[PDB]
Amino acid sequence: SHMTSATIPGLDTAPTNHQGLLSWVEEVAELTQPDRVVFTDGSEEEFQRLCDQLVEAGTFIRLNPEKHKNSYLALSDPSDVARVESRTYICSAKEIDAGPTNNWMDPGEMRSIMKDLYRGCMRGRTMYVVPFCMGPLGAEDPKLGVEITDSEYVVVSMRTMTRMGKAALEKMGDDGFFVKALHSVGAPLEPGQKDVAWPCSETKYITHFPETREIWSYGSGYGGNALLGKKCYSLRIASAMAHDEGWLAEHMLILKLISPENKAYYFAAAFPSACGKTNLAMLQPTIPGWRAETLGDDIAWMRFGKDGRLYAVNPEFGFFGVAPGTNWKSNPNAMRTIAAGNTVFTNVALTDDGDVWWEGLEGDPQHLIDWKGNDWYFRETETNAAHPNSRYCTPMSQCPILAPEWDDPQGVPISGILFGGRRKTTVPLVTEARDWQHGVFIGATLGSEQNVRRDPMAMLPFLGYNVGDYFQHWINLGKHADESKLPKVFFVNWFRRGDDGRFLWPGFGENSRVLKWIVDRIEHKAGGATTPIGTVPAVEDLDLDGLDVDAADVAAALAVDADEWRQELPLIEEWLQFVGEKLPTGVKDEFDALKERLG
Ligand SMILES: Nc1nc2c(ncn2[C@@H]2O[C@H](COP(=O)(O)OP(=O)(O)NP(=O)(O)O)[C@@H](O)[C@H]2O)c(=O)[nH]1
Ligand SMILES: [Mn+2]
């Protein structure tokens, strides 16, 4: 009962304008043997049809519309939320081009394994062909993709997370290049066999072929394993493209900050997971006259404009945020974005009146159904009501502080790039780099206590090629740029603690005071101390007006202690050794220069 592609339902009515796409779709369908093939158009009628089917399958339940319009709750197989870094691969032709931060396999060996897994994997299922565009549809070189998937959950989430469907398919023209992204949950069905709400496999691979810009995923239906724009395209494949094409694909929020003189500044900031991207991206300044708007909280693609400045675009179309921790007091703008509805929640808890809840959210609900479908009771049940890494998936357009520039293909000119992580000691609240090459060193040696883990530019899990070559790429882009037009680089730490365990700096909205110093430095309106690690403000250089904080604590937050930094050196040295043969001389130079300044 194997079917030739031309007899599989849906392929006789397939779009024919792009023969490369059609031939690829035919080849994949011949291999995976779906019951039918559907090309998705991204329309609202399609979205509701797919949602109805997800409700029927039990994958979704419809939330109370009086509290969230057009919103759904999905509960996954508990086995499909586990970390799968070890199953994530960069399959470059040579191992060195994957490098020490990546998992490599010979691409021939990998294709042999995965093509075997894919054979017949879609039996009993619909195969969706999902065209999408990463970034605004009006770009010079629009980065397009097509994800083939057997998961309706994936289609609905891709509609929110990318510009999906008709417009992207048309942008491909008759022979445009696109990233081929193949996905299966790896759970074939027999005719008449009852499905489960969340199909998946015990066998998982998330594989990237940098040379051909291809992504092959098998066995997980969850998050960045299955929504292939989110990390696989946005960072892994795109970093390889950016390497070859002279631009940057980075793990950065994009923030627009407006000063009391009504001038806008744009910042890109790279922090590792759980280090404050979402809170900073949706900053509410605490000092009069300062306003903030968001362009993104996860991925930034930066390209030089004709004027010589670096311009950032957010290639995504939605927010895919961690729900626990998000609440009305820490981040009301996130909550307001979610409140507007059109949201899919995954693995959060269900209230008695059809609302959702997660740890950290206001409300103290007395009874919930938890993320496994079991009864949960306030101050009694010893298990989390929502999965600790549960998610909301919501349109960016619903964010009340969305910058008007958010859908501009040209993007926004970046004045400053920020790097930061969680450091209990050593690293000051804010430091400005000495120059671009020093800034590259600061990003390259970014540490976070998540033992201090080095997470260079917050890209440790996401580089599409050798980490050393990636540092060289950063060095190259600055070397060939107009120095006066490059973003200035800053190093922040919201997380320094005193001996009694408390945070020296209050953070959150008060980070606007740090950003004010950064703006002033960009405008040459602020001073600071010249220290061995860069320029660091004194307490008197910061606007602490109206801030109920002990000045000694702010002083401590800003201290540069030579002894602490001397203990930091061998940790940095161990890391630069780990980077391996491709460590750029320019990065080693900065290490040497830091060691010299410290004495
Ligand atoms: N002490 C302190 N904690 C902060 C600050 N900003 C954010 N956090 C805390 O950091 C944790 C995660 O913050 P979040 O903004 O979600 O970081 P994130 O980088 O977006 N996580 P992810 O990127 O994986 O979605 C939250 O518990 C939040 O309370 C800050 O300025 N100071
Ligand atoms: Mn976040």
XYZ file of C-alpha atoms and ligand atoms in Angstrom:
632
model
C 0.000 0.000 0.000
C 3.007 2.306 -0.465
C 1.920 5.291 -2.586
C 3.884 7.091 -5.308
C 3.962 10.805 -4.476
C 1.756 11.802 -7.418
C -1.056 9.630 -6.010
C -0.861 10.937 -2.430
C -3.916 13.145 -1.807
C -3.042 16.847 -1.819
C -0.124 16.570 -4.218
C -2.364 16.842 -7.298
C -3.473 20.305 -6.120
C -0.044 21.387 -4.877
C 1.302 24.797 -5.938
C 3.536 24.384 -8.998
C 5.124 27.827 -9.359
C 8.232 26.694 -7.446
C 9.400 23.373 -8.884
C 12.266 22.992 -6.407
C 9.812 23.159 -3.503
C 7.382 20.783 -5.243
C 10.079 18.221 -6.024
C 11.367 18.313 -2.440
C 7.836 17.888 -1.080
C 7.231 14.948 -3.433
C 10.474 13.269 -2.392
C 9.750 13.699 1.313
C 6.167 12.409 0.977
C 7.358 9.412 -1.030
C 9.633 8.644 1.929
C 7.413 9.351 4.944
C 4.137 8.105 3.412
C 1.583 10.486 4.932
C -2.133 9.974 4.338
C -2.250 13.352 2.577
C -0.297 16.565 2.013
C -1.560 20.040 2.936
C 0.118 23.320 1.972
C -0.642 25.894 4.660
C -1.668 29.469 3.888
C -1.526 31.130 7.303
C -5.115 32.342 7.062
C -7.396 32.831 10.047
C -9.874 30.272 8.711
C -7.026 27.750 8.484
C -5.898 28.547 12.040
C -9.360 27.887 13.471
C -9.750 24.699 11.433
C -6.451 23.377 12.762
C -7.360 24.465 16.296
C -10.713 22.646 16.048
C -8.855 19.495 15.048
C -6.431 19.962 17.937
C -9.353 20.287 20.370
C -10.921 17.126 18.891
C -7.638 15.229 19.251
C -7.339 16.311 22.885
C -4.106 18.176 22.154
C -5.797 21.476 22.958
C -8.575 22.513 25.277
C -10.213 25.876 24.574
C -9.724 28.395 27.333
C -12.530 30.601 28.682
C -12.922 33.375 26.086
C -14.075 35.874 28.719
C -10.519 35.706 30.107
C -8.433 34.878 27.016
C -9.944 35.343 23.544
C -9.095 32.559 21.076
C -6.668 30.758 23.395
C -5.759 27.164 24.111
C -4.008 24.912 26.618
C -1.836 22.011 25.473
C -0.445 19.362 27.824
C 2.511 17.398 26.459
C 3.778 13.891 27.062
C 5.902 14.350 30.211
C 8.753 12.621 28.356
C 8.911 15.309 25.664
C 9.911 18.240 27.879
C 13.345 16.862 28.825
C 16.544 18.590 27.700
C 17.918 17.224 24.444
C 21.151 19.106 23.906
C 22.881 15.743 23.619
C 20.521 14.898 20.736
C 21.163 18.194 18.938
C 23.812 18.080 16.213
C 25.772 20.311 13.857
C 26.699 18.047 10.957
C 29.278 20.051 9.034
C 31.462 18.140 6.546
C 34.407 18.382 8.954
C 34.270 18.067 12.748
C 36.447 21.148 13.255
C 33.736 23.262 11.650
C 31.301 22.209 14.343
C 33.891 22.824 17.053
C 34.120 22.208 20.809
C 30.762 23.838 21.716
C 28.820 21.607 19.348
C 27.897 17.948 18.945
C 29.169 16.600 15.643
C 28.462 13.581 13.493
C 29.646 12.805 9.974
C 26.781 14.091 7.816
C 26.730 10.899 5.743
C 26.333 8.796 8.887
C 23.633 11.127 10.177
C 21.661 11.090 6.919
C 21.799 7.286 6.945
C 20.363 7.146 10.461
C 17.686 9.784 9.937
C 16.506 8.713 6.492
C 15.912 5.318 8.039
C 13.854 6.875 10.845
C 11.852 8.961 8.357
C 10.822 5.979 6.192
C 7.071 5.549 6.700
C 7.103 7.766 9.782
C 4.034 9.762 8.737
C 1.685 6.857 8.050
C -1.809 7.698 9.286
C -1.000 11.410 9.466
C -1.357 14.605 7.477
C 1.905 16.061 6.192
C 1.834 19.865 6.385
C 4.029 22.010 4.165
C 4.535 25.305 6.002
C 6.133 28.197 4.099
C 7.426 31.005 6.289
C 9.540 34.140 6.311
C 12.029 35.073 9.035
C 11.777 38.827 9.525
C 9.563 41.424 7.815
C 8.378 40.406 4.353
C 9.785 43.573 2.762
C 13.503 42.849 3.209
C 16.295 42.964 0.613
C 17.312 39.354 1.184
C 14.245 37.885 2.932
C 15.227 34.644 4.682
C 12.565 32.130 3.763
C 11.946 28.579 4.900
C 9.541 25.707 4.547
C 8.917 23.402 7.430
C 7.400 20.053 6.568
C 5.752 18.589 9.675
C 3.225 15.951 10.718
C 2.228 17.975 13.768
C -0.795 20.278 13.787
C 0.498 21.790 17.044
C 3.632 22.823 15.166
C 1.630 24.448 12.366
C -0.469 26.574 14.739
C 2.598 27.643 16.743
C 4.549 28.450 13.566
C 1.705 30.712 12.498
C 2.291 32.772 15.634
C 6.099 32.523 15.724
C 6.848 33.299 12.049
C 5.229 35.094 9.148
C 3.634 31.961 7.824
C 1.796 30.930 4.679
C 0.688 32.631 1.462
C 2.894 35.731 1.555
C 6.058 33.750 2.287
C 5.261 31.161 -0.399
C 4.793 33.946 -2.952
C 8.070 35.566 -1.915
C 9.843 32.323 -2.877
C 8.905 33.029 -6.491
C 9.667 30.266 -8.972
C 13.216 29.433 -7.848
C 14.038 31.379 -4.683
C 16.300 29.810 -2.085
C 14.706 28.581 1.135
C 15.775 26.631 4.210
C 14.494 23.060 4.032
C 13.255 22.094 7.482
C 11.917 18.579 7.937
C 10.118 17.457 11.077
C 8.279 14.374 12.271
C 6.993 13.388 15.688
C 8.006 9.809 14.759
C 4.708 8.209 15.737
C 3.177 6.531 12.670
C -0.429 5.329 12.951
C -2.131 2.255 11.554
C -5.411 2.752 9.681
C -8.145 3.230 12.268
C -5.687 3.433 15.180
C -6.556 5.893 17.960
C -3.961 8.668 18.333
C -2.738 10.239 21.595
C -3.014 13.967 22.390
C 0.777 14.471 22.227
C 2.547 12.037 19.868
C 6.321 11.746 20.049
C 9.122 9.164 20.006
C 11.704 7.845 22.456
C 14.199 8.393 19.624
C 15.037 12.100 19.137
C 17.409 13.950 16.810
C 17.608 17.677 16.087
C 20.121 17.932 13.299
C 21.529 20.847 11.316
C 23.413 20.686 8.026
C 25.134 24.082 7.790
C 26.425 23.861 4.209
C 23.023 23.189 2.661
C 21.110 25.189 5.296
C 18.934 22.190 6.149
C 17.313 21.211 9.447
C 16.093 17.664 10.141
C 14.174 17.012 13.341
C 12.666 13.703 14.512
C 10.840 12.476 17.585
C 9.936 15.546 19.603
C 6.862 17.694 19.205
C 8.045 20.286 21.698
C 9.272 23.853 21.595
C 12.556 24.549 19.845
C 12.851 20.908 18.740
C 9.790 21.211 16.543
C 9.143 24.919 15.944
C 12.084 25.077 13.604
C 12.262 28.838 13.190
C 12.734 29.408 16.942
C 16.377 28.363 17.468
C 17.265 25.986 14.625
C 16.817 28.584 11.886
C 17.032 31.853 13.921
C 20.402 31.023 15.461
C 22.018 27.790 14.277
C 21.475 27.934 10.543
C 21.371 31.736 10.501
C 24.706 32.051 12.334
C 26.285 29.994 9.541
C 24.613 32.148 6.900
C 25.721 35.295 8.739
C 29.281 33.974 8.865
C 29.374 33.527 5.081
C 27.414 36.681 4.244
C 28.962 39.307 6.521
C 26.285 39.891 9.153
C 25.362 38.695 12.672
C 22.646 36.323 13.933
C 22.549 36.612 17.705
C 20.730 35.662 20.896
C 19.742 39.221 21.776
C 16.713 41.214 22.825
C 16.152 44.493 20.992
C 15.146 47.463 23.132
C 14.128 51.002 22.160
C 14.833 53.552 24.879
C 13.589 57.129 24.573
C 15.212 59.893 26.645
C 13.587 63.050 28.081
C 14.793 64.973 25.020
C 12.620 62.548 23.027
C 15.531 60.897 21.229
C 15.376 57.144 20.618
C 18.260 54.745 21.193
C 18.255 51.064 20.253
C 20.077 48.413 22.243
C 20.741 44.748 21.581
C 21.472 42.630 24.648
C 22.660 39.033 24.940
C 21.985 37.238 28.225
C 21.844 33.459 28.707
C 18.538 31.821 29.658
C 17.013 33.054 32.925
C 19.337 36.078 33.061
C 16.749 38.757 32.377
C 16.171 39.174 28.633
C 12.392 39.281 28.800
C 12.334 41.692 31.759
C 14.805 44.088 30.098
C 13.133 43.813 26.695
C 9.885 45.021 28.301
C 11.496 47.529 30.666
C 9.331 50.115 32.444
C 11.759 52.920 33.367
C 11.520 54.280 36.933
C 12.943 57.726 36.221
C 10.800 60.555 34.768
C 10.977 61.305 31.055
C 12.403 57.936 30.068
C 10.258 55.528 28.033
C 10.898 52.081 26.606
C 9.412 50.033 23.789
C 10.190 46.476 22.673
C 11.319 45.067 19.333
C 12.168 41.571 20.571
C 13.206 39.464 23.523
C 15.181 36.603 22.006
C 16.741 36.856 18.539
C 18.378 39.752 16.713
C 19.747 39.724 13.183
C 22.173 42.602 12.634
C 23.424 43.850 9.273
C 25.408 46.922 8.251
C 23.386 49.603 6.476
C 24.705 51.877 3.720
C 25.426 54.523 6.352
C 27.863 52.188 8.103
C 25.767 51.553 11.210
C 24.625 48.125 12.427
C 20.857 47.604 12.039
C 18.879 45.016 13.996
C 15.753 43.152 12.916
C 13.769 40.590 14.924
C 13.334 37.589 12.624
C 10.455 36.234 14.716
C 6.759 37.123 14.739
C 5.728 35.950 18.197
C 6.854 35.478 21.798
C 7.604 31.960 23.045
C 8.109 32.715 26.709
C 8.644 30.732 29.879
C 5.452 31.136 31.860
C 6.500 30.437 35.472
C 7.912 33.612 36.996
C 5.930 35.841 34.663
C 3.444 37.894 36.676
C 1.618 41.223 36.769
C 4.152 42.915 39.049
C 7.468 41.719 37.611
C 6.290 42.081 33.987
C 2.834 43.626 33.469
C 3.591 44.279 29.793
C 4.139 40.575 29.167
C 0.921 39.830 31.058
C -0.956 42.407 28.994
C 0.402 40.861 25.785
C -0.902 37.469 26.926
C -4.219 38.933 28.181
C -5.121 39.995 24.628
C -5.499 36.291 23.833
C -4.643 34.425 20.617
C -2.259 32.458 22.817
C -1.311 28.799 23.070
C -0.140 27.802 26.548
C 1.805 24.565 26.936
C 2.028 22.694 30.266
C 0.522 25.340 32.537
C -2.299 24.701 35.030
C -6.058 25.078 34.478
C -8.311 27.036 36.872
C -11.906 26.091 37.696
C -13.204 28.931 35.506
C -11.139 28.106 32.417
C -8.255 30.499 33.066
C -4.599 29.464 33.289
C -2.132 29.610 36.190
C 1.529 28.967 36.902
C 3.880 29.335 39.856
C 4.625 33.012 40.468
C 1.372 34.292 38.996
C -0.988 36.275 41.257
C -4.288 34.800 42.443
C -3.699 31.959 44.926
C -6.158 29.610 43.200
C -7.412 27.046 45.725
C -7.792 24.182 43.256
C -6.217 23.633 39.832
C -5.797 20.865 37.345
C -2.032 20.573 36.969
C -0.047 20.058 33.780
C -0.434 16.276 34.024
C -4.211 16.490 34.394
C -4.261 15.821 38.146
C -5.922 17.680 41.008
C -3.739 20.297 42.710
C -4.575 22.036 45.986
C -3.240 25.279 47.452
C -0.722 24.890 50.310
C -1.085 21.121 50.115
C 0.045 19.604 46.822
C 3.812 19.157 46.811
C 4.259 19.220 43.042
C 4.327 22.241 40.735
C 0.948 23.023 39.176
C 2.593 24.196 35.946
C 5.681 22.559 34.468
C 8.666 24.634 35.602
C 9.601 25.266 31.944
C 6.031 25.679 30.629
C 5.351 28.166 27.838
C 3.125 30.812 26.341
C 3.088 31.376 22.584
C 1.633 34.791 21.728
C 1.647 37.246 18.779
C 4.203 40.044 19.066
C 1.687 42.492 17.614
C -0.344 42.338 20.843
C 2.387 43.802 23.020
C 1.205 47.213 24.339
C 4.744 48.624 24.302
C 5.685 47.292 20.866
C 7.865 49.813 19.000
C 6.363 51.133 15.742
C 9.601 50.070 14.029
C 8.944 46.374 14.774
C 7.929 45.411 11.229
C 10.353 47.690 9.341
C 12.497 45.577 6.979
C 15.449 47.934 7.459
C 15.474 47.406 11.198
C 16.810 49.827 13.786
C 20.287 51.312 14.243
C 22.013 49.821 17.286
C 23.809 52.237 19.629
C 24.965 49.701 22.189
C 25.401 45.958 22.513
C 25.088 44.585 26.030
C 26.393 41.308 27.439
C 25.507 39.961 30.856
C 25.008 36.859 32.959
C 24.439 35.866 36.588
C 27.537 36.597 38.702
C 27.351 36.650 42.514
C 30.763 38.334 42.694
C 33.495 39.938 40.634
C 31.630 41.531 37.720
C 30.408 45.130 38.266
C 26.850 46.332 37.686
C 27.949 47.933 34.411
C 31.207 48.339 32.463
C 31.892 49.886 29.055
C 34.396 48.156 26.754
C 37.589 49.962 25.741
C 36.929 49.413 22.022
C 35.315 46.877 19.692
C 37.973 44.179 20.014
C 37.802 44.412 23.796
C 34.007 44.197 23.508
C 34.410 40.974 21.521
C 36.560 39.614 24.340
C 33.923 40.591 26.899
C 31.220 38.775 24.937
C 33.489 35.787 24.255
C 34.222 35.270 27.943
C 30.724 35.950 29.309
C 30.252 33.889 32.460
C 27.070 32.867 34.198
C 26.498 30.798 37.312
C 24.086 28.289 35.778
C 30.719 26.987 38.998
C 30.905 29.719 36.356
C 29.778 28.481 32.948
C 31.197 30.369 29.974
C 28.422 31.159 27.519
C 29.998 33.310 24.792
C 27.575 35.976 23.557
C 24.895 33.745 25.147
C 25.329 31.425 22.142
C 26.803 28.325 23.808
C 23.913 26.028 22.791
C 23.202 27.739 19.490
C 26.311 28.259 17.330
C 26.108 26.829 13.823
C 29.875 26.610 13.444
C 33.196 26.638 15.283
C 33.181 29.000 18.308
C 36.670 30.293 17.511
C 35.715 31.125 13.938
C 32.645 32.859 15.344
C 34.844 35.109 17.508
C 36.970 35.824 14.418
C 33.845 36.790 12.510
C 32.976 39.326 15.207
C 36.539 40.650 15.054
C 36.371 40.906 11.261
C 33.108 42.835 11.199
C 34.527 45.481 13.559
C 37.908 45.636 11.820
C 36.320 46.487 8.473
C 33.730 48.880 9.890
C 33.770 52.627 10.468
C 34.823 52.604 14.133
C 32.728 55.696 14.871
C 29.529 53.973 13.763
C 29.895 50.663 15.583
C 27.731 50.037 18.628
C 29.590 50.588 21.884
C 29.828 47.390 23.940
C 28.753 47.112 27.576
C 29.004 44.384 30.170
C 26.250 44.262 32.814
C 25.558 42.268 35.977
C 22.212 42.603 37.729
C 23.049 39.779 40.101
C 25.967 40.737 42.357
C 25.336 39.890 46.012
C 26.644 41.102 49.370
C 27.889 38.797 52.130
C 24.400 38.626 53.666
C 23.092 37.129 50.406
C 21.014 40.072 49.195
C 21.218 41.674 45.767
C 23.322 44.826 45.896
C 21.252 46.296 43.047
C 17.426 46.223 42.940
C 17.284 45.712 39.165
C 14.175 45.310 37.016
C 12.771 48.774 36.232
C 15.687 50.362 38.090
C 17.946 49.007 35.348
C 16.727 52.104 33.501
C 19.277 54.002 35.632
C 22.050 51.837 34.224
C 20.729 52.345 30.695
C 20.716 56.113 31.330
C 24.448 55.977 32.053
C 24.910 53.923 28.899
C 23.021 56.526 26.840
C 25.032 59.316 28.441
C 28.286 57.495 27.594
C 27.160 57.127 23.978
C 26.473 60.887 23.940
C 29.741 61.733 25.755
C 27.706 63.259 28.598
C 28.943 60.918 31.366
C 32.184 60.036 33.102
C 33.406 56.913 34.845
C 36.487 55.260 36.279
C 39.152 53.745 34.043
C 39.645 50.245 35.530
C 41.582 47.198 34.299
C 38.354 45.675 32.916
C 36.974 48.812 31.239
C 35.134 52.012 32.133
C 32.974 51.619 35.247
C 30.835 54.409 36.734
C 31.227 55.540 40.318
C 28.065 55.894 42.410
C 28.106 59.639 41.681
C 27.976 58.905 37.935
C 24.586 57.172 38.261
C 21.166 58.779 38.661
C 19.999 57.364 41.995
C 17.468 60.128 42.594
C 14.270 58.733 44.083
C 15.893 55.333 44.577
C 15.571 53.953 48.114
C 18.943 52.193 48.187
C 22.066 52.418 50.357
C 24.782 54.151 48.318
C 27.385 51.806 49.816
C 25.543 48.878 48.238
C 25.624 50.554 44.825
C 29.315 51.247 45.396
C 29.839 47.594 46.186
C 27.883 46.616 43.069
C 30.284 48.746 41.017
C 33.542 47.714 42.695
C 36.424 46.299 40.654
C 38.493 44.224 43.019
C 41.883 43.274 41.589
C 42.130 40.134 43.719
C 38.749 38.877 42.495
C 39.817 39.526 38.914
C 43.095 37.685 39.423
C 41.025 34.650 40.435
C 38.955 35.142 37.307
C 41.987 34.925 34.981
C 42.661 31.197 35.195
C 38.968 30.488 34.615
C 39.069 32.590 31.469
C 42.332 30.923 30.455
C 40.823 27.428 30.844
C 37.948 28.522 28.626
C 40.166 30.020 25.922
C 42.093 26.737 25.898
C 38.797 24.892 25.468
C 37.943 27.051 22.440
C 40.852 25.250 20.806
C 42.984 25.748 17.727
C 40.573 28.272 16.212
C 40.827 30.757 19.093
C 41.596 34.077 17.410
C 44.831 35.864 18.224
C 42.712 38.983 18.786
C 40.909 37.287 21.663
C 44.150 36.018 23.173
C 45.498 39.591 22.816
C 42.723 40.963 24.979
C 43.303 38.293 27.605
C 46.991 39.212 27.725
C 46.167 42.923 27.928
C 43.698 42.346 30.765
C 46.279 40.319 32.698
C 48.804 43.143 32.189
C 46.416 45.878 33.373
C 45.516 43.880 36.480
C 49.138 43.386 37.503
N 17.686 40.275 40.906
C 17.195 40.456 39.574
N 16.472 39.388 38.923
C 16.000 39.592 37.583
C 16.233 40.792 36.907
N 15.657 40.673 35.662
C 15.099 39.462 35.572
N 15.313 38.786 36.710
C 14.839 37.459 37.079
O 15.460 36.559 36.118
C 14.567 35.442 35.975
C 14.376 35.196 34.515
O 14.175 36.479 33.957
P 13.823 36.584 32.406
O 13.502 38.029 32.147
O 12.669 35.686 32.036
O 15.122 36.068 31.630
P 15.135 35.397 30.211
O 16.520 35.604 29.633
O 14.122 36.040 29.222
N 14.801 33.771 30.385
P 14.650 33.148 28.859
O 15.531 33.926 27.930
O 15.059 31.663 28.830
O 13.233 33.271 28.399
C 13.220 35.832 36.588
O 12.988 35.109 37.766
C 13.371 37.241 36.949
O 12.724 37.517 38.187
C 16.970 41.886 37.577
O 17.164 42.901 37.023
N 17.439 41.690 38.896
Mn 12.571 35.096 28.095
